[PDB]
Symmetry: D2
Subunit: 350 residues, 4 copies
């Protein structure tokens, strides 16, 4: 085949530099790009009305936590709405994030859609006019993006079609992002839903990631200018057999070692509904795994970083401080976790 440089040396350096800053040692990502529809249940759990002002207040609360979170947060992913909101002092949220040493990210997909002929499987949309949207987001402060694809482990899933199609759409999204100076975070999430075990999850994860990277190669994606946001390898949420954190860490690191090229700048694990402690302990175990890991292994958590903060807030302004404290606690815990320094107090079998 013949080469037709998709990117210039300058464009590569920009993308690579951004990717490295986000996952710099001890740093991780705050995934706060929930939409009105997904954050609705969050707020209703604390009897708080889901208005634009309350969403703004809650996001301000997380974004303006004291400097203790600075060394822990390399990036913050915002939803469109939030990217254009301002703190009480009039400062745009992207500015608030940057001033704290964080890189600003933006969710760009437009949700999942049903794949006809499959057993409830989906693909993700959002490519239409994506280039122009990225150019605008870039001008408005964002340097990286989020696009979520969802795959499910079942009797006949994920199917060959679901894997191939989701891998392909992720490559398209990545290509467009890189053309506009936006570091794409590739997210092929395999849900923990089901009664499958650890080995089954490792197997599917390995097959999905191999497909993802072949697609990235086919689409001429610059890996140094990307990040990977995969599910950790864990047993199904309803799996009868139980496993230790060390087993989870081994399955996860092994799967990644067998599929993720060293060129990938970093891996930002999704929380996948895990609890704040569970997510921190597993990340720590992953970093302590005695196997060689050529990429940063950090976090990109949503509720695993917000759960306690949201609850402490309870929708009451006088609980601002108490709420931010909980967030700071999870940021500190996960910052230590991505270094294998967190303490709450035969690989051939894989």
């Amino acid at each position: 085949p013949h080469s037709h440089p998709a990117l210039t040396p300058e464009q590569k350096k920009e993308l690579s530099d951004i990717a490295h800053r986000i996952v710099a040692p001890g740093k991780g990502i705050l995934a706060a790009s929930e939409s009105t529809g997904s954050i609705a249940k969050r707020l209703q759990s604390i009897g708080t009305e889901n208005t634009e002002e309350n969403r703004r207040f809650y996001r301000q609360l997380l974004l303006t936590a004291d400097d203790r979170v600075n060394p822990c947060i390399g990036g913050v992913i915002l939803f469109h709405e939030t990217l254009y909101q301002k703190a009480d002092d009039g400062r745009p949220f992207p500015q608030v994030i940057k001033s704290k040493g964080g890189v600003v990210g933006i969710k760009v997909d437009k949700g999942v859609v049903p794949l006809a002929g499959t057993n409830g499987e989906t693909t993700t949309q959002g490519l239409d006019g994506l280039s122009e949207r990225c150019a605008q987001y870039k001008k408005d402060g964002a340097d990286f993006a989020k696009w979520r694809c969802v795959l499910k482990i079942g009797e006949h899933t994920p199917s060959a079609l679901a894997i191939m199609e989701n891998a392909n759409v992720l490559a398209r999204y990545a290509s467009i992002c890189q053309q506009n100076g936006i570091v794409p975070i590739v997210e092929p999430e395999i849900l923990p839903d089901g009664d499958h075990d650890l080995k089954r999850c490792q197997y599917v994860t390995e097959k999905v990631l191999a497909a993802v990277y072949k697609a990235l190669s086919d689409h001429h994606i610059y890996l140094e200018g990307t990040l990977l946001k995969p599910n950790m390898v864990t047993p199904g949420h309803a799996c009868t057999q139980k496993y230790s954190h060390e087993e989870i860490a081994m399955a996860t690191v092994t799967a990644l070692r067998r599929t993720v090229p060293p060129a990938v700048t970093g891996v930002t694990f999704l929380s996948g509904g895990q609890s704040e402690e569970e997510a921190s302990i597993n990340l720590n175990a992953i970093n302590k795994c005695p196997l060689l890991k050529p990429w940063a292994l950090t976090f990109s958590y949503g509720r695993a970083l917000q759960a306690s903060a949201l609850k402490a807030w309870g929708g009451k302004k006088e609980n601002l401080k108490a709420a931010q404290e909980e967030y700071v606690k999870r940021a500190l815990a996960n910052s230590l976790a991505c270094q294998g320094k967190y303490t709450p107090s035969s690989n051939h079998a894989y």
Copy 2:
């Protein structure tokens, strides 16, 4: 694999019946779905302000041609704007089309976008929210759709990426259309630009179509409920070697026979900028080709049906009758052509 019926027997019958009506013996398609941007040039050539009124009048002029076109036109592709316009007498254009025995089609793609890392190649966008759009279009009179992908023959093109990506997006578009009772016309156009000869076009056409149908298969597309809108096999515009219409016909029919499954209801050849006469003579030769053709071989022409009409109209409402007369003559000419009855006055070598 495991079957998870994308369509029910009823849905299949509906799509199959629509597809067959469009390409019924002697019938073809009037491709009139030009956008304001694509219609601009042609209106400029006749010194006419590109206004919605003139566009409506022009389209009205074509859609209201006398009853002689009825047995010639099985379908009419409209642009979004036109689908919601009405004739002077108040009748919605879709209704005008159906009263004349024609099926209403709607262009649903959102144009081409560049593929990074390629030598000027593209893919096509338009999948976002396509399902809701198809449902809306169906409710408003449309029974089939148009989606144009574009490939080019060059030194290193069409590339493996371009072929694969375009085939895949065409499959997604087809899948969504069929879920909403809309017959998708699969259009993988290979431009005639370049100095390549006839065999080079035939080779590329065979490779592209083979990739198209494998992709349709992977996406569980119901072939009986689709139509194929390919380029005819011809030498490039800059090719110095001359060929007869019989050779063009042999190369065309041979390429289709080697790649298009018999289950495909019909082939509606795109005019690809050919002249009115050229398009008719070639279609005629293709239908007279000795080889066995398991599918209808007809037309889906743009300028090949509108050329003389647009010119005779020249924006003059007074030329209405003269303009329509030109359109009628080409509809009649191509109706005979798709039956191998039009007259202006060794296969192993393929």
Copy 3:
């Protein structure tokens, strides 16, 4: 991309002409390429010692049947051993076949081998030195070849790997054959084993054939110079739900119309485990199916053409005439079937009704 002609117009003509002669109207194929270990079983049932002479004799019995089979047999597939054996008059079997207006075929695959990491799935070997073998077989009278790939319907089969690998190897085999003037019969057999239903078999057959032709395209295979030997679309041998011959034909022709390009010269169905009558009745229904069929739809039967013959012979040289008579009967029946003009109702024999199914 760019075209680097794999074949010349002359080579294409020779391949196309051969493929057409094999499936000419009313003609089918006699699949007599059973190996020693495979035919040993057949000779065992009739209590006949599996020796080279008995095999030679039996094959001679089929190849030398009276001239009534001439218009019925377009081709005869032989095993390596048989290609080099002679009839009692010293005539090489290939010459015998040819003198009766038939094209000689040769089995070239070296059997199936297990695909590691799968649930009992396989792929087929035999590509090593295939080019030289084809060039030699061509000189020795062969004009087409046979290569069998086997897939099975189950909970997780056929897997993505099994389908892709078998489609790819078939494509390599077809490529090498065409380079040596040998028409390759593409055979992606989907076993009838299991309790799946008709629509399940149809779904799998469509997916398998789609993969097969995409692979043939990738490998620059000249379809007009090839033939397809697929399984008919039927329910699993253990399926409880019953289907009519018209339903089997509808499912079969539908799967074919949805995947097999018109350029393919002909489809020569394998009988699977169907009895002599079942194979004939289904083939007839297929040819009577209303749907448009751009390719010849005929047969390439092994036991579906030899069942009654073997029984009548029993290993007794004195039952020669009786044995050949049964073979001739099935050849005539299938010759009519591949034209949609077969109507049983008679003395076909109980042996022609017995299921020839053998678990895999």
Copy 4:
């Protein structure tokens, strides 16, 4: 979407231990599996008759070099004939190799064959009966294998078919090998022939390796139990533009980092016609490259290890010691190179 373990934990352990021993720190591979037809050219360059005894003597000359090569040679690839030959003392060559701390390898492919419809491209044959052959070779002292696929850079090559077919056959070969306790060395050699520059080779190498590993994944290949034998990324032999060893190293390591999973135990670079000295300097530069490399980067050299030895020997028994000394010198040099400690004495990242 379901797993059916191709290998057991015991089988994986055996394959992993073998792969690691071969590329342990400071060790590389002696590629001495030249066929009679291939070795004929070598023997003729020194006016030596191509007989089985002369071939035996030559191979013995290499295999019996003094203990200095022991820490330098992790493996030795032999041709079928040599696997069954013996040293003067009667010791089977596989025993000689093992006694010196080396692992024995066997070439199992049956050469390249033309791919119809392509511009002189090929694929490789040799899968037929491969499983029985591996079981037999395993029993007779072999623990790893060699299978060479050849791709060429040209106006329209490597084509999609060539890349896909070669990647697939390499996967089938690896699968069969692992079922028989044999560590497969995956060899997708992209020839250096042509006037293409460094960037083009890097581009083609990246695409080829991407296809190779996707195929290995599709065939359920255990990467920890495999080694990769790729070409270094260099300009074409006819390229007018000149490049430094540092650039060749950066392009090479960059291509590997972008395509080879860290699970792969090691990369054993083929010499590909490079001179003895050039191959050592490039390997050393590769090991010094300021980028993270999660796999051993060593050698699997043929002529880059035998060139001088073959010449010094000249086919005369009296030159044995002089011939072995030449081989030993290259073994020591490359042992240092695959550690980045090589010296003639003996003691812009985003532009890729």
